[PDB]
């Protein structure tokens, strides 16, 4: 029980000291380590409730029962007298660098999860390597260390979203007394891209600095796991070599899909290319209906573009569909055109991209609606947002034994372990997990602590909150209304809802009953809050706090007894009273 924990901790930890806070012999060892720049984990037996058992169980390893005890990669090294003997005899550094492997830990992938896992393992003395490589897009776009979010995801798209929100700030400003005239002001795309790319470049640099200051080896190379302990690397010069590591963490992420139609790869782009595009896209078609598709179409329209979205069936598949529809109704009322129930058949090139004068090309798009009618239109840019996928047959030889699911994602235990006992997987390629940056970071850090510091805490993947950053934002935590009804039945579900109007919108003459929120509850479990949903400004800031209360099991009575902050949008959640079953209107 406890004995199985100590055996697992001693075997994978790299350098670990078993100690007591009260002991001066322990402190003198801590002082020698280091002094010699030796990083190590530390376990304070007098802090754990069953420290007395662990102390006794240590003897099965060292034949002794006192503290301090210092281990290196599963082997007992000695007590106080024995460590100092190794110190003053110049023997200690060679002991702590003894390893059957090149590294204690190899991370494949330099993104949100990989960077987090690597930095955390180094903090407990694990000798660590982080591999990262960015395969170019079809037109050759490439970027720096840090992953999809930092370079071509959350970070550049929220910045561009903010550029879009600022257009309504300029409008709202006249109503509040500022002299400017919004209709005489325009937007410069390349100025915005330059500022976004400057910030991304400082994140690239900061990560290389952080790996250096933690003694992590960074290799800009493509990794391939060929046996449980061997990683084959190909570098910037196509030179090939093999390195070994004790533990492996796969964290390679995904890349955008293209539909299998003529002209797609040749003449269109994806979001990988959009955030550093040297020219404004101009008249744009977005193909898809994911949050990537709706967020990108949304800010392009706000920046003055002529934007159309082509929707195969529904918006935001997998999210609450009433919320999805309200999100789309708002974008359509503020400029974004929709071609509903429609798929593309081919893209035809009329103008090549004008790389000299810095202008987009011109394309002809042909498709069809679900009733057979035809679609034909010209656009300057075609953006595909039709999902994302890993390509683990490029990271992972089939002979190693890592089981994959139907979609090509790694099947893992609830401690991130794959079917091969020393190989783990985190982030987007972990099958069945929410694909989100804060999830990948938490999974990476907690895994690093279990591998190298004897921690036990697991990552909790339930009820992770989300926010879709459309022109009007949409934040959520928990089940959709239709999922709650499907799971418990309509008679056990109660939904409280209300419209609302931000106070900032009054003087600026904006819509009265467009913002909206609801709580979906379970009658038979004390009116437990099963899902929360809000459409409105700053929806992410609104939603985050409530996710702690949902984690804790919050009910409708808990919301009722909490008092609101006034004047805020978020306070509407503390006074909700109209139910859907009542049939009373939710307008205010």
Ligand X SMILES: Cc1cc2nc3c(=O)[nH]c(=O)nc-3n(C[C@H](O)[C@H](O)[C@H](O)COP(=O)(O)OP(=O)(O)OC[C@H]3O[C@@H](n4cnc5c(N)ncnc54)[C@H](O)[C@@H]3O)c2cc1C
Q: Tell me the catalytic residues.
A: 566
Binding status of residue 197 toward ligand TEK by CB under 6 A? no
Q: How far apart are CA 453 and CA 548, in angstroms?
A: 27
Cα angle value 165/168/171 (rounded, 5°): 155
For residue 583, give every residue at least 6 positions away whose Cβ sits within 8 Å of its Cβ, in sequence order, or none: none
Residue 489 CA to chain centroid, in angstroms? 33
Q: How far apart are CA 390 and CA 358, in angstroms?
A: 33
Task: Provide the annotated binding site.
Answer: 20, 55, 67, 80-81, 112-114, 132-133, 148-149, 154, 157-158, 222-223, 225, 252, 255, 288-295, 312-313, 317, 387, 391, 397, 428, 435, 437, 483, 509, 560, 562, 566, 574
Among 217, 234, 555, 579, interactor with ligand TEK by CB under 6 A: 234
CB of 475 to a second copy, least distance (A): 7
Task: Provide the annotated binding site for FAD.
Answer: 112-114, 132-133, 148-149, 154, 157-158, 222-223, 252, 255, 291, 391, 428, 435, 437, 566
Binding status of residue 222 toward ligand TEK by CB under 6 A? yes
Binding status of residue 28 toward ligand TEK by CB under 6 A? no
Q: How far apart are CA 550 and CA 528, in angstroms?
A: 9
For residue 426, the SS3 value is coil
CB of 564 to a second copy, least distance (A): 4
For residue 540, give every residue at least 6 positions away whose Cβ sits within 8 Å of its Cβ, in sequence order, or none: 467, 469, 473, 475
Total site size for a second copy, rule CB under 8 A: 76
For the chain, the C-alpha Rg in angstroms (whole number) is: 28
Pairing of the two strands 230-234 and 240-250: antiparallel
CB of 92 to ligand X, least distance (A): 35
For residue 548, give every residue at least 6 positions away whose Cβ sits within 8 Å of its Cβ, in sequence order, or none: none
Residue 207 contact among ligand X, a second copy, ligand TEK, none, beta carbon within 5 to 8 Å by kind: none
Residue, CB closest to ligand TEK: 236
Sign of torsion, CA 551 552 553 558? negative
CB of 190 to a second copy, least distance (A): 8
In DSSP notation, 455-487 reads --PPP--TT--EEE-SSS-EEEEE--HHHHHHH
Is the N-terminal amide bond of 258 cis, ω within 30° of 0?
A: no
Binding status of residue 235 toward ligand TEK by CB under 6 A? yes
Binding status of residue 541 toward ligand TEK by CB under 6 A? no
Task: Provide the annotated binding site for NAD(+).
Answer: 288-295, 387
* Whether the Cβ atoms of residue 384 and residue 287 lie closer than 8 Å to each other: yes
Among 67, 196, 365, 400, interactor with a second copy by CB under 8 A: 196
The site for ligand X (CB under 6 A) is made up of 108-114, 131-134, 147-149, 153-154, 157, 222-223, 251-253, 271, 292, 394-395, 427-428, 435-438, 440, 566
CB of 133 to ligand TEK, least distance (A): 5
Among 551, 579, 580, 586, interactor with a second copy by CB under 8 A: 551
* Whether the Cβ atoms of residue 392 and residue 423 lie closer than 8 Å to each other: no
Among 82, 215, 417, 568, interactor with a second copy by CB under 8 A: 568
* Whether the Cβ atoms of residue 410 and residue 395 lie closer than 8 Å to each other: no
The binding site for ligand TEK (CB under 6 A) comprises 133, 220-222, 234-236, 238
């Amino acid at each position: 029980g406890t004995s199985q924990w100590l055996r697992k901790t001693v075997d994978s930890a790299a350098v670990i000291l078993f100690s007591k806070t009260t002991c001066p012999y322990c402190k003198k060892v801590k002082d020698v380590l280091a002094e010699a720049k030796i990083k190590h984990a530390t376990i304070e037996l007098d802090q754990l409730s069953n420290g007395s058992a662990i102390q006794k169980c240590l003897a099965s390893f060292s034949k002794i029962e006192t503290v301090p005890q210092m281990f290196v990669r599963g082997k007992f090294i000695g007590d106080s007298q024995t460590v100092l003997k190794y110190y003053s005899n110049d023997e200690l550094a060679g002991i702590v660098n003894e390893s059957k492997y090149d590294y204690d830990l190899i991370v494949i992938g330099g993104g949100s999860g990989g960077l987090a896992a690597g930095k955390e393992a180094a903090k407990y003395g694990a000798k660590t390597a982080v591999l990262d490589y960015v395969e170019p897009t079809p037109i050759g776009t490439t970027w720096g260390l840090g992953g999809t979010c930092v370079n071509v995801g959350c970070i550049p798209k929220k910045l561009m979203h903010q550029a879009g929100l600022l257009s309504h700030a300029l409008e709202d400003a006249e109503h509040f007394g500022w002299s400017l005239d919004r209709s005489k002001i325009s937007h410069n795309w390349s100025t915005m891209v330059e500022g976004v790319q400057s910030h991304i470049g400082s994140l690239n640099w900061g990560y290389k600095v952080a790996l250096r200051d933690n003694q992590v080896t960074y290799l800009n190379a493509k990794g391939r796991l060929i046996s449980p302990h061997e990683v084959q690397i190909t570098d910037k010069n196509q030179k090939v070599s093999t390195i070994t590591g004790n533990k492996i963490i796969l964290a390679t992420g995904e890349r955008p899909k293209y539909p299998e139609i003529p002209g797609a790869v040749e003449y269109g782009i994806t979001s990988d290319d959009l955030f550093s595009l040297p020219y404004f896209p101009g008249k744009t078609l977005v193909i898809g209906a994911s949050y990537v598709a709706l967020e990108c179409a949304g800010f392009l329209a706000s920046l003055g573009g002529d934007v159309t979205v082509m929707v195969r069936s529904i918006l935001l598949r997998g999210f609450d569909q009433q919320m999805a529809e309200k999100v789309g109704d708002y974008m359509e009322n503020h400029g974004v055109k929709f071609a509903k129930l429609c798929v593309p058949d081919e893209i035809k090139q009329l103008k090549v991209v004008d790389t000299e004068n810095n202008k987009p090309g011109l394309l002809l798009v042909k498709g069809h609606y679900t009733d057979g009618k035809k679609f034909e239109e010209e656009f300057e840019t075609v953006i595909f947002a039709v999902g994302r996928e890993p390509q683990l047959s490029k990271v992972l030889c089939e002979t190693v034994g890592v089981k994959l699911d139907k979609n090509g994602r790694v099947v893992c235990t609830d401690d991130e372990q794959t079917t091969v006992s020393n190989v783990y997987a985190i982030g987007d390629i972990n099958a069945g997990k929410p694909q989100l940056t804060p999830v990948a970071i938490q999974a990476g850090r907690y895994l690093a602590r279990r591998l190298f510091a004897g921690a036990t805490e697991l990552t909790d993947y339930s009820n992770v909150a989300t926010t879709v950053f459309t022109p009007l934002e949409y934040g959520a935590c928990g089940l959709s209304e239709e999922d709650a009804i499907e799971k418990y039945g309509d008679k056990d579900i109660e939904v409280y809802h209300s419209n609302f109007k931000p106070l900032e919108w009054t003087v600026a003459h904006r819509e009265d009953n467009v913002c909206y929120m609801k709580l979906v509850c379970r009658k038979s479990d004390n009116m437990r809050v099963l899902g929360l949903h809000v459409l409105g400004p700053n929806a992410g800031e609104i939603t985050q706090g409530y996710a702690v209360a949902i984690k804790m099991g919050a009910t409708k009575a808990d919301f009722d007894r909490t008092i609101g902050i006034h004047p805020t949008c978020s306070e509407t959640f503390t006074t909700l009273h109209v139910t859907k079953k009542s049939g009373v209107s939710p307008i205010v």
